[PDB]
Amino acid sequence: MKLHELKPAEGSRQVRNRVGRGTSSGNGKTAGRGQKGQKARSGGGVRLGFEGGQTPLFRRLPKRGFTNINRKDYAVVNLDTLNRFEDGTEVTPVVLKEAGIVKNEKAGIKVLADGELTKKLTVKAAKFSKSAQEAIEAAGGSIEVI
Amino acid sequence: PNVALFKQDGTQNGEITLNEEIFGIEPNESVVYDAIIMQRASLRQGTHAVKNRSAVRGGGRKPWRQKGTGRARQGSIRSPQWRGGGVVFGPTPRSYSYKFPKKVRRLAMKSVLSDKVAENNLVAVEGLSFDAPKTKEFKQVLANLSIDTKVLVVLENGNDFAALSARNLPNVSVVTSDNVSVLDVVSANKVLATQTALTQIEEVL
Amino acid sequence: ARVKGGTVTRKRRKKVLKLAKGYYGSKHTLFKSAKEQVMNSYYYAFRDRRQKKRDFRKLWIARINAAARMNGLSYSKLMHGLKLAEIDINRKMLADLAVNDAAAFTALAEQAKDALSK
Amino acid sequence: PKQKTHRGLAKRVKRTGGGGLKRGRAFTSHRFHGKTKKQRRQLRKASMVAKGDYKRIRQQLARM
RNA sequence: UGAAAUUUUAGUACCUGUGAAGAUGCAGGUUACCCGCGACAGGACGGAAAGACCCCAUGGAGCUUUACUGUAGUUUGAUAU
RNA sequence: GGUGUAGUGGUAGGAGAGCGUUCUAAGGGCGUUGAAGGUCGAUCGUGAGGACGGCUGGAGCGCUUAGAAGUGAGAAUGCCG
RNA sequence: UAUCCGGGAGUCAGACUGCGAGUGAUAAGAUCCGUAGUCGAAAGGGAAACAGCCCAGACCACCAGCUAAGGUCCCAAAAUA
RNA sequence: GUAGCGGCGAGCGAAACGGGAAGAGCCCAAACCAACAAGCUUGUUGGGGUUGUAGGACUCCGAUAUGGUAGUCUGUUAGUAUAGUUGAAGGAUUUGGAAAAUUCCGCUAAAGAGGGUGAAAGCCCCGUAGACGAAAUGCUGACAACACCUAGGAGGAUCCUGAGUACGGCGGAACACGAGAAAUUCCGUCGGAAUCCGCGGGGACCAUCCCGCAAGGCUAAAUACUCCCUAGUGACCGAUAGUGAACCAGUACCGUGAGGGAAAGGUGAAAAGCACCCCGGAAGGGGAGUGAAAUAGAUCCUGAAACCGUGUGCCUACAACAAGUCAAAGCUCGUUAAUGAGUGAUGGCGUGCCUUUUGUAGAAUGAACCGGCGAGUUACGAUUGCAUGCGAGGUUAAGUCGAAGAGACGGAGCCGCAGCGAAAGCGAGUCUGAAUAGGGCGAAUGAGUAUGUAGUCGUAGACCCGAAACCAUGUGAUCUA
Ligand SMILES: [K+]
Ligand SMILES: [K+]
Ligand SMILES: [K+]
Ligand SMILES: [K+]
Ligand SMILES: [K+]
Ligand SMILES: [K+]
Ligand SMILES: [K+]
Ligand SMILES: [K+]
Ligand SMILES: [K+]
Ligand SMILES: [K+]
Ligand SMILES: [K+]
Ligand SMILES: [K+]
Ligand SMILES: [K+]
Ligand SMILES: [K+]
Ligand SMILES: [K+]
Ligand SMILES: [K+]
Ligand SMILES: [K+]
Ligand SMILES: [K+]
Ligand SMILES: [K+]
Ligand SMILES: [K+]
Ligand SMILES: [K+]
Ligand SMILES: [K+]
Ligand SMILES: [K+]
Ligand SMILES: [K+]
Ligand SMILES: [K+]
Ligand SMILES: [K+]
Ligand SMILES: [K+]
Ligand SMILES: [K+]
Ligand SMILES: [K+]
Ligand SMILES: [K+]
Ligand SMILES: [Mg+2]
Ligand SMILES: [Mg+2]
Ligand SMILES: [Mg+2]
Ligand SMILES: [Mg+2]
Ligand SMILES: [Mg+2]
Ligand SMILES: [Mg+2]
Ligand SMILES: [Mg+2]
Ligand SMILES: [Mg+2]
Ligand SMILES: [Mg+2]
Ligand SMILES: [Mg+2]
Ligand SMILES: [Mg+2]
Ligand SMILES: [Mg+2]
Ligand SMILES: [Mg+2]
Ligand SMILES: [Mg+2]
Ligand SMILES: [Mg+2]
Ligand SMILES: [Mg+2]
Ligand SMILES: [Mg+2]
Ligand SMILES: [Mg+2]
Ligand SMILES: [Mg+2]
Ligand SMILES: [Mg+2]
Ligand SMILES: [Mg+2]
Ligand SMILES: [Mg+2]
Ligand SMILES: [Mg+2]
Ligand SMILES: [Mg+2]
Ligand SMILES: [Mg+2]
Ligand SMILES: [Mg+2]
Ligand SMILES: [Mg+2]
Ligand SMILES: [Mg+2]
Ligand SMILES: [Mg+2]
Ligand SMILES: [Mg+2]
Ligand SMILES: [Mg+2]
Ligand SMILES: [Mg+2]
Ligand SMILES: [Mg+2]
Ligand SMILES: [Mg+2]
Ligand SMILES: [Mg+2]
Ligand SMILES: [Mg+2]
Ligand SMILES: [Mg+2]
Ligand SMILES: [Mg+2]
Ligand SMILES: [Mg+2]
Ligand SMILES: [Mg+2]
Ligand SMILES: [Mg+2]
Ligand SMILES: [Mg+2]
Ligand SMILES: [Mg+2]
Ligand SMILES: [Mg+2]
Ligand SMILES: [Mg+2]
Ligand SMILES: [Mg+2]
Ligand SMILES: [Mg+2]
Ligand SMILES: [Mg+2]
Ligand SMILES: [Mg+2]
Ligand SMILES: [Mg+2]
């Protein structure tokens, strides 16, 4: 390109709308705020979720549940993703991380049976769904609980 | 692609091949535009400020009582409507620099270089050597190569004499092969690069 | 990037004042009064470009009425007769004939009277 | 600064797979003698935040 | 010798009527040559003061008490010296 | 680009597209043979607005594309003169 | 045209007119609803003047024509039909 | 913005792990030994020792080295700060008062940054690139010297290892944690341990296990800030702006005092600042001069509008006027040459602008006029649209190098690709349920992500102006009691 012939991509940049700059612009005088009231004031408006004094929805509804301190979440992997490897490959958490399939393993890799497996693989993971284990074994592979 | 190689004296050697990944792609106009805008913004210093009513000197007391005087009610002699009062909003020191995805940055650089090559504004010289820095000699070199417009001279690292002899010419902008920017390439109408510099560029990208 | 007032303000206000040339005193001297008057001038001008057509049709009708009476006919009877006689000469031209070409106007009136008789 | 989460709502609702909000039911605390067994049975079941209420509160849960 | 309040621009009539319901300015009619000077104060809902009366604001302040919640002081006990 | 049909009052307000101001970059220009600015003119565009001449003035300023905003005043018993 | 999904609102003082009711005294330019219109946010013609009534919805130009409500002796266009 | 805290409201809000900047570790008390003085211990000095895979004393051995410093107004040396030296290259022609401008030829460049010079200068000047320079006084870095730290192994019989301390009750406070189930830390009051088979912590508490060793001290760097000094920068201001202050500004002025707090820049290239003459008492003018220009004459560049005045082309003394608009004779004049311009007898129509209202010509509000200034902004987040890059992937943050740039590295981390459940947990399902039933939420039925931009929102004063008031320092009994 040439510095004297620059052209942005169509629709990439827009013009800021400036309020209170004459009537014909459509945002003169009141600047789109309307006429009087609380919302027409500088810094006006009520806090989010406020309802003018009616009991807000969150106040109406009850608190529920708790968070388990020892909660364990697993990075999930499916047979479709496993199909990305070749027969006889040794699928490992390190292998998945290097492949970028599982950037964060959380508490460990758990393999699920969402897709259809088609390669014989020796999969090592923290946990396997029973269906996932059946699919891996039925495809001629094996599963080891790391 | 292939670009004619010239010797410093001006005579042409055999052509040399440039990596198609770098000098052979279809340039991306919008990406180039984004890079130019972003770099120009990053050049901004943005040291500018104004004094709001709280920063202006004095202005604590109420100028006169709320009611009775028949005058408009005022709260401080430094209110924005007052002559010498504070400034409503206005500039504040800030930075205008942002960053693009690395892939977009790389694509923009390749696009400008490929654009130069396609337009045949890329002149590759086998080498630029000067026993001592002499602007007259480098100007003669440009004449031999038949370059008379804005030219970006890209030199391999360490070619201090070449860089010195070239820098003072108004139409010449000197950069090292390691430190080249989309803005530099686009500003220059032609790009004069030595073969070592081109090799280093291809290595970098 | 400070943008001081500049000269756009003076340019705009001078345009208004030039529009107001000829007004009475302050109405041509002062911008606020001038602008107020120029706005009313616009309102009146737009209204009068419509009233102008009404006024001239009214003037033509009055003149045609006078001429028709001199020819022994009321305006209403004359126009009814002309419509019956298929004459489409409009009121502007009819008034022109009445004032200038009384002979031609009399011919038109005679045709109208003939049509009415039939 | 970082926008804050409304802690009361965080305790009371759950984000669902489809982006909606799962909520408990009101009138499930006491005074059950005043409610028919059908009412208790059908209030035992969770529900979803209505469209109007969700549009009012979504920004308070952006990063729940 | 030389101010001031006020002041949207004013070539600034009367009656009846109309109108945000009390018109110099609108309608109909009537009266009235142009410019002043000295006087009067009926009108310009005249000037002056973002009405103090009245109501409102989830306003302020001072005061009161067997309003609420506190607390300085006074007093009683335990404990240490 | 043409034809046809239909449509084009508007406050709060939503959408769209533009005018003009200062500055930055690049390109291309103009200036003691007179820039900006001021004033006058019967000029041009659908609008904001744009030129062109005369006079005044005496040194800086347009235009194209893109960019950033202390970017547009007639009212605040606004402030200053 | 309706739905649905999403971005952005403003509105929560209404007025009168006709019709159907309440309250009132079968008073109010009263009050409160239902219903339609208009004003609000609508210029133009008529009703003397006259937001809400009658006719009728201004993108512009014309010194062209035909009509609506309402009118045709003069003010004042049109029948002393 | 998670775990949490919270009239479980408004809101407040971590830490550890991970990635980086920077890195450095050391001394006593005690036991024990020697000396000394008193009055066998008990105090001064010295030695000795410094810890958790327990260390030390003490007893045996063997070593009298090896390394080091966060020391020194100790010298030597180098650099550097505080003055400076040097530093290339142009003449003509045109216009002009004047050349840097125009035109023709040149020349320099490790210097084409910048400023000045009679207008705009690479080559006229100051400079810049580059080279060089310090008597004296600082500062830094080295080198030396001095100074000061620096021992290995084996045994435990005994001895030491911080007391009104830790800890507890009560009352407060700090920990994001508001007494709460409440750890941990700290203050006041009272009570009050153990001591290596010992003691503390791992969020009440106990047990087990693990980790550590309080009640003694010191310790550079990474970090925060800039009254000042030097050199620079700016899509920062350009005289109502920018500091309140471009100028004799915290001045004038105001106040008893604390305190409040202005206005005010521009002749010309050069004063060449108008010799002399005339009117006038002067002021001020008219000539005459200086100057390119004096309508640049010091109230001095430009010189707007309000406001005031002189001259006059047209009109006006029977007229009821929101001042105009439409129609228009007459008169005057001749343009951006346009079916022109000024004025205007007379005729038609016609109650300003704004705000606020159901409704305002309104006898409701605001504006005396003119000029200037004067109101939705930025930062960080959220969300949607549009755009671009990549795409079941997308992407870096801090930080290092770099011109205050781009860029490179940096994959920690974040979003997405799996959901369901309060949770254990299961998983294209899951929850409820006795249920292979039904139903809820999901999948079948796939697009995300980084950035730009715009709309809106949240935290911030959040579009601008405006209270009566509240609180915390101060100044006031020169009036008055
Ligand atoms: K709005
Ligand atoms: K709930
Ligand atoms: K309940
Ligand atoms: K009124
Ligand atoms: K009077
Ligand atoms: K009081
Ligand atoms: K001009
Ligand atoms: K602004
Ligand atoms: K004003
Ligand atoms: K909608
Ligand atoms: K009704
Ligand atoms: K956070
Ligand atoms: K609350
Ligand atoms: K020692
Ligand atoms: K120069
Ligand atoms: K020295
Ligand atoms: K606690
Ligand atoms: K611990
Ligand atoms: K530990
Ligand atoms: K001058
Ligand atoms: K005159
Ligand atoms: K008239
Ligand atoms: K009043
Ligand atoms: K976006
Ligand atoms: K089921
Ligand atoms: K199911
Ligand atoms: K995308
Ligand atoms: K603000
Ligand atoms: K805002
Ligand atoms: K006294
Ligand atoms: Mg923008
Ligand atoms: Mg609007
Ligand atoms: Mg306005
Ligand atoms: Mg308002
Ligand atoms: Mg209201
Ligand atoms: Mg509102
Ligand atoms: Mg209530
Ligand atoms: Mg203040
Ligand atoms: Mg006043
Ligand atoms: Mg200021
Ligand atoms: Mg202005
Ligand atoms: Mg008509
Ligand atoms: Mg229960
Ligand atoms: Mg019931
Ligand atoms: Mg009436
Ligand atoms: Mg009356
Ligand atoms: Mg009138
Ligand atoms: Mg009046
Ligand atoms: Mg009064
Ligand atoms: Mg009041
Ligand atoms: Mg229409
Ligand atoms: Mg300018
Ligand atoms: Mg502004
Ligand atoms: Mg009523
Ligand atoms: Mg309204
Ligand atoms: Mg109407
Ligand atoms: Mg109205
Ligand atoms: Mg007809
Ligand atoms: Mg008639
Ligand atoms: Mg008759
Ligand atoms: Mg251990
Ligand atoms: Mg020199
Ligand atoms: Mg030259
Ligand atoms: Mg606390
Ligand atoms: Mg403890
Ligand atoms: Mg205690
Ligand atoms: Mg524990
Ligand atoms: Mg430190
Ligand atoms: Mg000035
Ligand atoms: Mg100032
Ligand atoms: Mg000042
Ligand atoms: Mg002059
Ligand atoms: Mg002057
Ligand atoms: Mg008469
Ligand atoms: Mg007369
Ligand atoms: Mg009212
Ligand atoms: Mg007033
Ligand atoms: Mg003003
Ligand atoms: Mg005192
Ligand atoms: Mg005294």
mmCIF file of C-alpha atoms (C1' of nucleotides) in Angstrom, chain H residues 278-352:
data_model
loop_
_atom_site.group_PDB
_atom_site.id
_atom_site.type_symbol
_atom_site.label_atom_id
_atom_site.label_comp_id
_atom_site.label_asym_id
_atom_site.label_seq_id
_atom_site.Cartn_x
_atom_site.Cartn_y
_atom_site.Cartn_z
ATOM 1 C "C1'" C H 278 2.722 76.399 10.990
ATOM 2 C "C1'" C H 279 -2.101 76.597 14.555
ATOM 3 C "C1'" G H 280 -2.310 76.028 19.966
ATOM 4 C "C1'" G H 281 -0.680 77.805 26.831
ATOM 5 C "C1'" A H 282 -0.412 72.915 26.297
ATOM 6 C "C1'" A H 283 -2.513 68.566 24.566
ATOM 7 C "C1'" G H 284 -3.403 67.496 19.641
ATOM 8 C "C1'" G H 285 -2.966 68.338 14.803
ATOM 9 C "C1'" G H 286 -1.238 70.061 9.388
ATOM 10 C "C1'" G H 287 2.935 70.151 6.532
ATOM 11 C "C1'" A H 288 8.180 68.622 5.964
ATOM 12 C "C1'" G H 289 11.013 64.274 6.840
ATOM 13 C "C1'" U H 290 12.495 58.409 8.348
ATOM 14 C "C1'" G H 291 10.626 54.068 6.394
ATOM 15 C "C1'" A H 292 8.924 49.156 1.458
ATOM 16 C "C1'" A H 293 4.699 50.643 4.244
ATOM 17 C "C1'" A H 294 3.179 56.202 9.253
ATOM 18 C "C1'" U H 295 -4.737 54.359 8.152
ATOM 19 C "C1'" A H 296 3.316 50.598 11.052
ATOM 20 C "C1'" G H 297 3.743 57.206 15.342
ATOM 21 C "C1'" A H 298 4.655 54.279 20.303
ATOM 22 C "C1'" U H 299 -3.483 53.665 23.128
ATOM 23 C "C1'" C H 300 1.692 51.544 17.679
ATOM 24 C "C1'" C H 301 1.060 43.906 13.529
ATOM 25 C "C1'" U H 302 -3.842 42.291 11.820
ATOM 26 C "C1'" G H 303 -8.178 45.535 13.566
ATOM 27 C "C1'" A H 304 -14.224 41.746 13.551
ATOM 28 C "C1'" A H 305 -19.169 42.924 16.127
ATOM 29 C "C1'" A H 306 -21.817 45.643 19.446
ATOM 30 C "C1'" C H 307 -21.877 51.140 19.909
ATOM 31 C "C1'" C H 308 -21.186 56.341 17.968
ATOM 32 C "C1'" G H 309 -20.810 59.727 13.752
ATOM 33 C "C1'" U H 310 -20.457 62.274 8.717
ATOM 34 C "C1'" G H 311 -22.213 62.211 3.306
ATOM 35 C "C1'" U H 312 -26.466 60.657 0.637
ATOM 36 C "C1'" G H 313 -29.431 57.145 -3.919
ATOM 37 C "C1'" C H 314 -34.700 55.922 -2.492
ATOM 38 C "C1'" C H 315 -38.935 56.526 1.089
ATOM 39 C "C1'" U H 316 -41.650 58.908 4.932
ATOM 40 C "C1'" A H 317 -45.836 64.231 8.591
ATOM 41 C "C1'" C H 318 -54.487 60.675 7.819
ATOM 42 C "C1'" A H 319 -51.054 56.713 10.008
ATOM 43 C "C1'" A H 320 -52.992 51.354 14.421
ATOM 44 C "C1'" C H 321 -46.856 48.447 12.284
ATOM 45 C "C1'" A H 322 -43.911 40.323 16.011
ATOM 46 C "C1'" A H 323 -41.842 44.943 11.507
ATOM 47 C "C1'" G H 324 -41.717 40.570 7.807
ATOM 48 C "C1'" U H 325 -43.457 37.815 3.498
ATOM 49 C "C1'" C H 326 -46.224 37.859 -1.239
ATOM 50 C "C1'" A H 327 -47.966 41.558 -5.122
ATOM 51 C "C1'" A H 328 -46.363 46.138 -6.811
ATOM 52 C "C1'" A H 329 -46.013 51.806 -9.672
ATOM 53 C "C1'" G H 330 -42.373 55.274 -9.452
ATOM 54 C "C1'" C H 331 -37.268 56.778 -8.761
ATOM 55 C "C1'" U H 332 -31.959 55.553 -8.617
ATOM 56 C "C1'" C H 333 -28.027 52.394 -10.275
ATOM 57 C "C1'" G H 334 -25.312 48.896 -13.772
ATOM 58 C "C1'" U H 335 -23.594 42.885 -11.694
ATOM 59 C "C1'" U H 336 -19.764 36.676 -10.402
ATOM 60 C "C1'" A H 337 -24.595 39.231 -17.081
ATOM 61 C "C1'" A H 338 -28.137 36.713 -14.162
ATOM 62 C "C1'" U H 339 -35.738 36.060 -17.084
ATOM 63 C "C1'" G H 340 -29.867 42.362 -12.703
ATOM 64 C "C1'" A H 341 -29.238 45.501 -8.032
ATOM 65 C "C1'" G H 342 -31.092 49.466 -4.221
ATOM 66 C "C1'" U H 343 -35.428 51.798 -2.486
ATOM 67 C "C1'" G H 344 -40.389 51.647 -2.147
ATOM 68 C "C1'" A H 345 -46.071 54.504 -2.512
ATOM 69 C "C1'" U H 346 -49.940 51.003 -2.201
ATOM 70 C "C1'" G H 347 -52.602 45.905 -1.583
ATOM 71 C "C1'" G H 348 -52.909 40.553 0.651
ATOM 72 C "C1'" C H 349 -51.389 37.454 4.640
ATOM 73 C "C1'" G H 350 -49.287 37.425 9.282
ATOM 74 C "C1'" U H 351 -49.272 37.320 17.658
ATOM 75 C "C1'" G H 352 -41.002 36.799 18.206
#
